[PDB]
Amino acid sequence: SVSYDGERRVNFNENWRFQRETNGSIAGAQNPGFDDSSWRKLNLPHDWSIELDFNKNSLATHEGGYLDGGIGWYRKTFTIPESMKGKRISLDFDGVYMNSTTYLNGEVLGTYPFGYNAFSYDISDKLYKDGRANVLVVKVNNTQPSSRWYSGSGIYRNVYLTVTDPIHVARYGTFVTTPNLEKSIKEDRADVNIKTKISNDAAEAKQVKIKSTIYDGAGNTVQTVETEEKTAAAGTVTPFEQNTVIKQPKLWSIDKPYRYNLVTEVIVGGQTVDTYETKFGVRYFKFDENEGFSLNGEYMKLHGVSMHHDLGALGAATNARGVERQMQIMKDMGVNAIRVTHNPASPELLEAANKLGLFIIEEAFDSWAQSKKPYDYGRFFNAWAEHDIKEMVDRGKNEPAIIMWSIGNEIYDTTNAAGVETARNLVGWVKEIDTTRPTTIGEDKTRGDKVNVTPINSYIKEIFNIVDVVGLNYSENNYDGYHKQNPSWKLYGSETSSATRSRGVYTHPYQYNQSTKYADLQQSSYDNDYVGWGRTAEDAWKYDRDLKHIAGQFIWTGFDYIGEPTPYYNSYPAKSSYFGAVDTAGFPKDIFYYYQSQWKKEPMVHLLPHWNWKEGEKVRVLAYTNASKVELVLNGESLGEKNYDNKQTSWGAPYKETKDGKTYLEWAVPFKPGKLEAVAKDENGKVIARDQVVTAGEPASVRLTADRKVVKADGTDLSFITADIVDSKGIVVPDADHLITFNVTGQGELAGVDNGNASSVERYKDNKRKAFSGKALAIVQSSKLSGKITVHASVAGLSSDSTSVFTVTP
C-alpha cells in the first residue's frame, strides 16, 4: 500500500521483486497470479549487470565490459489508498535499459525500446479501486550485443507515480524563456516569457486561471502574475502565455550557477487544485563563426569532456551524489562543459551541472536507421526517433546548463541521401519543441588522412548546413580549413584525443605509440599512448588553443567507463576503458594535472612519475604547470631550472610553451632515493607553487580517507573512502597491489569497491579489492537512520585502519 501524504510525485522505487532469466523463458511472469514469493526483493534504482561476475563468454564482449544482460523481470504488487481516489496517476520511469514491456494487472501498458529516455504510462483507470492488489510487471529485454560501451541492464534510474487533480499542468508543461536577453540586460532587466499547458482529463469543461510566481534562491517573491479565466475543454490541452520581468536579475554562469524557481498554481473555482515547480536560470550565449563561444557576453573556450553514464562500481544505477562527485572532479580539472555521449542524461546529471556550473550538450542518438550493433536502437529508429528526440528536448528545455542539442554521433547514414532527409526531420522535430538552443552533430567521417583539409562528402556537407553548429570528431586537420571555406559555420571538436593511459603507469617514456598493446595490459601516463585516429592530449589541445573560432573541445573522455578497453580488443581481462583523465574510481591520472596546467588560473605544479626506481636508472621526469619556470631539487640539491617562453596566439592571448613546442617541463634524472621537489616560480623568481614526489619504504599499513565527513541519512547519499597502501612515514607505495578487506558498521552499507584498473576482472560488488598503483576505493551508502558510519580496512601483514562519517536527517 502506497504512502501518500498529498505530494505530486511519489517515490516508487521500493519493494520490487526481481529475477533474471538464466534457464530460458519464465512462463507467466507477467500475470497477476504468478508466484514470486521466492524472488529476491530489492529497491531501485538497479543495474543487474554490475552484480554479475565478469564473463569472458558474454555476448557483450569486451565492448560492453564482459557483463551479461539478457532478459530480466521486475514485479511490484501494491495497493492505492483512499486518499488517492479520483486522482490522475501516471507511472513514470526516468529510464530502463532496454526494450521493456510493462504489464499491469495482466494487460500490456506498452513497450519502450530506447534505453536512455524517461517514459510514462497513465494508469488512472487501470488500477483496481476496491483495495484489491495491483501487479505491475516490467520485462526488460537487453539481448546483446546492443552497445559499443557498458550499458548496464534493468531499471537503473528512479521510478515515480505522478499524482494530480484531473485538471493539471501537463507533462513537461512549462516552458520558461528569456527573449532578447542580450538587449534587455543592457537596461538591467530580464524579460521572462512563460508558456503553460493545462490538461483537462475530467468529464466536463471548466474555467481555469494560472497564477505564476517567481522566487529567488533564498525563497523571496520576485513576481506574481495571474491570468484571466479561460475555458478548458474536457479531454484537451489548453495553453496559457504570460510575460513578466525580473529586475537586476542574478545570472546563471559557470562561476555562479544561480537559479530562480517558478511556482505554477492551477486555479479552478477560487481553489488551487494543482501546483508545479520549474527551476530555471537566466543566461544568454552565442556561438560566433569567427570569435567562438561566449556566455552572458563573456568570451570563453569550452573546456569540455565526454562522459558515459555509468558510475563505476555502482554500474549504471544512477545516484545524485555519485554523478555530482564526477562533475566536481571535472570542475577541479578545469572543465566547464560536458558532452553527454551518446544519449540523454539522467536527471541527476542535469541537476549536477545546473547546480555546480557546467554546460551540457545533450545527445540523442548513437545510430539512426543503420545499426552499429544488431540489437541497438537502429531497428526501432524509423518508428521511434520523433518521439525519443522530442522526449529529450521537452524534458530539458528549461535547464540552464543545457546549451546545445546533438542529433547524433558518428552516424553511418550521413554519407547518403536518406541520412540528409533524416537530419532534416530530426532538426525539425527539435525545433517544434525548442528554438532557443542550437542543434549540432558529432561527425567523424571528414577525418581523411588527418593532415590535409579533407574535401567534404557532399551529403555530410548538406547536413553540416542543416544543423546550427558543426561538431567534428578527431578531425583537427579541418578546423581552420572548413572555417575558411564556409565562413558562416560554427565549429568545435565534438570528440578529441582519445589518448589512452593507466593510473600510475610509466612505460616506454620516450616513445609515442599508436593503438599499441603491451604485455602488462596497461597504457602509459606520459601522454604517449593514443589511438591511431586520435592524438595526444597536448596535440589535440594545441589545435583548439591556437584558433579563436573553434568554440572548444570535448575530450574522449573525462572519466573512464566500463567497456571499450581500446586498444585491447578481445583480450579479457581487459574490460574497462583507458581513455579517461580520471579512473572509474575518481582517482586522477597524471593527465588530469596536465589539463589543469592548461585550463586553470590558480598556480600549480605536478610532478611525475613516482620516485621508486633502481639506483642510477635515468628517469623521465615531467612537471605539469602553469608557472613560468620550475626548479627541481633532489634531496636538497638543485638539478636546474627549466622555463617556458611567454607566447601569444594570433589574436594576442598569452600562453606558455617551451622554445621547442612542449606545454610541460622536462628533466632526465638519474635515480637516487629520497625526495624530489619542484619549485614553481613566476618571472621574478618568486615561489608560487610546490610539489613533491618521495621514495616510499616497505608497505606498513592501509590508510583510509573519506571524501566528506558528514552526509545525509536519506538511504541514497554516499561517502567515498580512499584506501591507500602507505609506508611507515605515510607515503603511498606507488606500485602496491595488496588485497584490502573492508567492513562497514553503523548507519550505512557498502555499495561497491573499485581500483580503476581496466584489466582487472575483480567484482565491483564485493567487500574486498586489490589496490592499484597504491590505491583502492570503497563506496558507502547511508541508511535512513541518522547516526554514524564506521569503515574498517585490513590487509594481511599490515596495520588496519578505520574512519568515520556522520549521517544526518536531511
306 phi, psi to nearest 5 deg: -90, 145
In the three-class reduction of DSSP (H, G, I as helix; E, B as strand; rest coil), residue 284 is classed as coil
- How buried is 107 (Cβ within 10 angstroms: 0-12 exposed, 13-18 middle, 19+ buried)? exposed
Fold for the domain defined by 1-165: Jelly Rolls (2.60.120)
- Element (H or E) spanning 325, and its range? helix 320-333
Q: 195 forms bridges with which residues in the sheet?
A: 175, 241
What is the CA 261 to chain-centroid distance, rounded? 24
CATH class of the structural domain 285-604: alpha beta
CA-angle at 741, arms to 739 and 743, nearest 5°? 170
Say how many CA atoms lie within 13 Å of 198 toward its Cβ: 33
- Cα dist. 584→250, 297, 501, 609, 755 in Å? 36, 36, 13, 21, 8
- The answer to whether the beta carbons of residues 758 and 503 sit under 8 Å apart is no
Method: X-ray
**Which triple of cell numbers denotes residue 373?**
550493433
Which grid coordinates are listed for 585? 574510481
Active site residue 683: no
- DSSP-derived secondary structure for 418-432: HHHHHHHHHHHHHHH
**What single-letter DSSP state applies at residue 368?**
S
Give the SS3 label for residue 667.
Answer: strand
Catalytic residue among 495, 538, 564, 677: 495
Q: Which CATH topology does 166-284 take?
A: Immunoglobulin-like (2.60.40)
> How is residue 799 annotated by DSSP?
B
Going by their DSSP bridges, the two strands 605-608 and 618-625 should be labelled as antiparallel
Q: What is the 3-state secondary structure (H, E, C) of 170-220?
A: EEEEEEEECCCHHHHHHHCEEEEEEEEEEEECCCCCEEEEEEEEEECCCCC
Q: 218-224: list long-range contacts, CB under 8 Å, 24+ apart.
A: 222/246, 222/260, 223/192
What the block records as the C-alpha cell of 392 is 529529450
Q: In DSSP terms, which residues pair with 40 in a beta bridge?
A: 18
Domain boundaries, the chain: 1-165, 166-284, 285-604, 605-699, 700-810
Compute the distance between CA of residue 609 and CA of residue 618 in angstroms, rounded to an integer.
12
Alpha-carbon distance of 483 to 466, in angstroms, equals 16
Collapsed DSSP state (helix, strand, coil) of residue 706 = strand
- Asked whether the beta carbons of 402 and 360 are under 8 A apart, the reply is yes
Domains 1-165 and 700-810 share a fold: no
Spatial contact of 587 and 576, defined as CB atoms under 8 Å apart: no
410 is catalytic: yes
Please give the grid coordinates belonging to residue 636: 636538497
Please state which CATH number belongs to domain 700-810: 2.60.40.10
Q: How many CB atoms lie within 10 A of CB 527?
A: 22
CB 123 within 8 A of CB 102: no
Please report, as a single letter, which amino acid is at residue 505.
V
| Alpha helices (H) in 553-639, listed in sequence order | 590-599
With beta carbons less than 8 A apart as the criterion, state whether 573 and 759 touch. yes
Which residue is it, cell 515547480? 277
Distance CA 554, CA 83 (A): 50
Matching residue, cell 561527425: 443
Joined together, the cell numbers standing for residue 449 give 588522412
Residue 334 to residue 261: CA distance in whole angstroms: 29
CA–CA gap between residue 688 and residue 178 (Å, rounded): 43
Out of 265, 362, 399, 410, the active site residue is 410
Determine phi and psi for 331, rounding to 5 degrees.
-55, -40
Grid cell of 52 as nine digits = 554479475
